[PDB]
Amino acid sequence: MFANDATFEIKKCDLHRLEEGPPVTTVLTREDGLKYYRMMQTVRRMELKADQLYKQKIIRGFCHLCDGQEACCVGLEAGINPTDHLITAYRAHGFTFTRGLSVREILAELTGRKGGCAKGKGGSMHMYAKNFYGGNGIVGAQVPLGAGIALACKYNGKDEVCLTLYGDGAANQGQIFEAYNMAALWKLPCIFICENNRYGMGTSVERAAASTDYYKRGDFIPGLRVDGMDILCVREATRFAAAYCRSGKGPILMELQTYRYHGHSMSDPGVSYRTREEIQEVRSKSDPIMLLKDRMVNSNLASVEELKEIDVEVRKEIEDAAQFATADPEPPLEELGYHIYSSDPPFEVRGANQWIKFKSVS
Amino acid sequence: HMFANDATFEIKKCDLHRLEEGPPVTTVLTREDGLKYYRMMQTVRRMELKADQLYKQKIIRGFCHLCDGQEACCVGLEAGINPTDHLITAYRAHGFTFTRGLSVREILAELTGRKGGCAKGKGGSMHMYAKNFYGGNGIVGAQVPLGAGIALACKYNGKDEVCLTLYGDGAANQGQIFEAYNMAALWKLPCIFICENNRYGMGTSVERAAASTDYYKRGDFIPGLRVDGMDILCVREATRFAAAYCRSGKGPILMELQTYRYHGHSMSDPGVSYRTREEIQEVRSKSDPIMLLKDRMVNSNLASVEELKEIDVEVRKEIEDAAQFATADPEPPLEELGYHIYSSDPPFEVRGANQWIKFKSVS
Amino acid sequence: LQVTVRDAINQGMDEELERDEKVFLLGEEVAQYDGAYKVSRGLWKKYGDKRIIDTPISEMGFAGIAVGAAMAGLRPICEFMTFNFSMQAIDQVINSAAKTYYMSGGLQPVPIVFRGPNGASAGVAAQHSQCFAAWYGHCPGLKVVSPWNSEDAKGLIKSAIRDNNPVVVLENELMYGVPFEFPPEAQSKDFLIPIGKAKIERQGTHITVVSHSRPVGHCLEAAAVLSKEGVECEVINMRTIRPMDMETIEASVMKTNHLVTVEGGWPQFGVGAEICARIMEGPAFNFLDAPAVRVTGADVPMPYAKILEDNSIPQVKDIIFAIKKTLNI
Amino acid sequence: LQVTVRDAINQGMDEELERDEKVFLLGEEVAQYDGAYKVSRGLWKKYGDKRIIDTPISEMGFAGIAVGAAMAGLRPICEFMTFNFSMQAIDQVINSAAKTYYMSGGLQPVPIVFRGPNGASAGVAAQHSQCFAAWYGHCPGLKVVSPWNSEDAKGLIKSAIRDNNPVVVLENELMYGVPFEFPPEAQSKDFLIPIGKAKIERQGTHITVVSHSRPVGHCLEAAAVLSKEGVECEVINMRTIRPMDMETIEASVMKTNHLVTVEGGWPQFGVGAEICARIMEGPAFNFLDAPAVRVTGADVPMPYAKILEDNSIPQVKDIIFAIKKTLNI
Ligand SMILES: Cc1ncc(C[n+]2csc(CCOP(=O)(O)OP(=O)(O)O)c2C)c(N)n1
Ligand SMILES: Cc1ncc(C[n+]2csc(CCOP(=O)(O)OP(=O)(O)O)c2C)c(N)n1
Ligand SMILES: [K+]
């Protein structure tokens, strides 16, 4: 006999121009808990597998991993509807899964095979899904795009919101400040989210930002700072920020304090600008998955043995996906020119000299 | 009749952002300084009104953005800084070109596109330069990072010089300005970011364009002050305070100058679709910067009505001469079309409208 | 009747706004100010705040917002006051809009239109005179058009709006007040000009003269002068920069044996360069009786002074000169 | 002595920093990270915070800061992590830097260098693979260069730094780790390569093959294969995109009678487009016994998948094929 649910304390958010923030208590059901645990573990194991495949040279170019930040993608999804919108930068494999793509499609995209979610056209940085707009490789560029998606939610009148994510490094891009001003001016249902993992590539927050209170950089935009290692903190803050945008009050900034265990990308060992001890300590004391596991077990929502059975099932899902991604064929060369334009008749695309022609179909 | 050597005046207290103490709320004006600021502002006003008349007669063409109503800003800013300090602004720069040291003749001859202009007719209204004056910039917001880099050079060279970096209320919503704020603060650049707020960005009022219209606070982590930009003494004092702040090594500061432009955005904008003629007339009658100084000087016995009238005559005659010059001066010769593409290079040829047309380019 | 270029663009936008509630216009001074060059006059009064949106001076930001809205299914028209100011926003045009359908494997279309005046005007100097036709034309995933007359501008703005992909419409400020005969077909709300197709504005036997935007009218003047001398120019109005209609230009050259390109932009890596290289790689090369040559703006930042600016843009006499060089006359 | 391209650039910068205290380097990760591709390795430890300056991710801002510092008399090297990211800043490069000396009538020079890797890499997909050679080449007031090997990179970075005008130095990320024999003249601190002069990398008599950056090495591989079959290619390394050395190409084609251009960029309005257009307008046209043709990247946003990427960039076999077509062999 497990508990059907339990009540948990969550850290109080720091507030900027808000007289009240998210609650400091929440109820988690056994059912929701097993779900979040499974999703976070699936993301973690997917990322570890990508690291493997990269080292085996089955993935190339960019591979930015989100391990350590699983309370963010899973917590954010836990606080919004399937009909809400989300856009992020290139560290997107987790959000690609939480917004509903399979591990198979994600890994086959990384391995550059036709079974990929973009048929091997996009690679790590450019994956899309229903109400998930990438997967954006130019730092900060996705922020005005998110505000525009929020503009469309308001135009269409269906009470949908858009979560618009950028990292700490991105936070110093001028277009983000341009977007804050217009979102405030037009009361756009845009939730600006700074995923603060302490480093923008190799540059710590203290060395890039004159002020490292990201949740206050919106200035006239209200903000909250949230513990992004705690899936329940993230979920509560997200529910609060979405209710805020749905009520017509306009945009809000949420800073998620989180941490990446890997380097900036597969090419960055991740240790010239921080210590291995720093990383180990974060992981040892505030890993998002161990934090939930402890909560569930100690409140009788689930057993050590249950969670271990989920781990075994996730491992088989990740192994199956990896086998598919490594055996699936590359896309056929004849499709090189496909999908340049939407809704157009076929045309020809010039290859490497004038005698090479590729058919382009929409 | 003996005149006072100096008098003390009350200046409006600045609103402050992240500063415990701001500029003084009184200041001493000497007769000599009064006379000089009065002549400077009148020179800028008469030059601008001449530009209007020249533009209507088609002697000036393309862009011409006038700064009348705002003379307390160029002149008061000049009064608060050294000749060896630096300044950069946008396109509404005729007054700054003058306060920074170019003649009315060179300015107007550049507007009329003649060889005697400060760029020999290459630049026109928006692009005039002088020593320690970096334009004169026609892309909105673009001069803000330039001004921050000029401050970085001041810091790098170690001469205790500062840079005044001016942008309008419309420009204040440009992303690169926020990028500049962050680097200036991070590096403690001696950059005074100055927002010249005349209430409109072309045809868009501040309330329609900016979610927050507190321009002095947009720097967020950067301190700022808001200053009466119709009061030349208010501007001078704020400026002295901001420059002292940057020279002390404390890093950047924002100053918002609340001012007003009597003309439209440019010669092509009547300036009446987005504001009333009464609003303009009431700003003029209540706050004209020249009228304000004239009344201070007369009421405090620093100058006579007849002395100031004589400066007006002298200035209007100067602008008539300058306009005669700019209107008679020949255009630049065609043969110099290609000149000054590259600095310090040997001569070369530039293609014209077809391959048989070749212009010599020399540095 | 006669309709000016500015009014034909206004007509096109008004019709498409009425036809589809998802279409909207944003940019600086589009709404209450009636447009920086009055091209959007009356639209805000007719459609309101929701549809005709005055923006702050935040090009990267509002271009990005427009691209996001298009991704979410809206159909924005994003006005740059001039294309000079598009440089601030050019990453959004190229990396967020142009490349997205391809990167996504055909999952995410981007139905956005960027429009605004492009190129030289009168005495606006070097930061405000630049032509971006070859820059935008270079880029896969974009369509790029450059209207000349009232018919061109209306039909191409309507086609751009109906297109499902990013379309750059390079207008011309000096053309805006020019009136043209506006035939019945053009006055209709169903009037569309296909993107990708040039139009022959004058039939000729002696030489093919190819241009885009304002200089098309200078080519016709040049041909009117030359015709009195027995020289018949075939004048081609490109209409589209990408994908350009090389077949039309080829068929003309095979007839006339001679080619001059005319454009207002800078010469090197310009529009004429691409036409010239295509004509040499293609089936028409052997039909040339002389080298193809290019008439362009002078290779300088645009000077202010009248006599300097006059000599920095192609004049009728420079087009005539190039043509007579080509014909050896 | 073999020196990799990355180390030769490093030597260039190091030598110019020591020589002139006004020289400084700024950009993302240039200082404490030793460079995003290790090109600036060891410079911060040698020169310190004041001279080697890590920036936030604020392209338009730090490029404008660099341009401003240059106007004031300093000699900045502004690194873009890649040139894809220069799009955010390209207004500063064009409107604030390139045009300013001309606008100011020769009063205000801008001695700035913009440098970093350009064009395609391995598997980095469409937002990260763009070549900007033709875009920057098009603009008066700029100089644009594009080194291939280690001598190229050292001599051109040093010329760029000593130039008093904006110079855009388009490097190549795949060349960084390639070692080259390094002549003793290139080891000198006085080693400079003149901007505006192409270099003949291989003499030949049958065909002129012109290229820039990485593909120059593929043209040389192509000529090695071809000369086993008795075909002698003259291979020309442009070095400079603007102002390009047309005189060297013309004199080569006047000897060989045939021309192929090879570039990694998109074909339309590309670098090959200008070379072909110039050859047709110029004195060598009558020397051509076949049309000049262009080998280029494929006309697509860059795909990720290896086989698609392989076929979106010129391969040696594509070069050999265009040469054989040109020679009718
Ligand atoms: C405009 C731009 N400049 C530089 C880069 C290269 N780059 C990719 S990610 C990155 C660091 C961004 O860090 P942060 O925003 O903190 O995101 P994180 O990966 O830590 O989530 C940089 C510099 C880029 N892609 N776009
Ligand atoms: C990036 C850019 N966008 C648009 C323009 C067109 N434009 C020139 S001035 C101006 C309004 C600027 O207003 P503000 O900053 O308030 O300056 P003011 O003239 O009132 O001092 C605009 C929209 C431009 N020159 N550059
Ligand atoms: K469309």
Ligand SMILES: [K+]
């Ligand atoms: K230099």
Ligand SMILES: [Mn+2]
């Ligand atoms: Mn980060």
Ligand SMILES: [Mn+2]
């Ligand atoms: Mn203003």
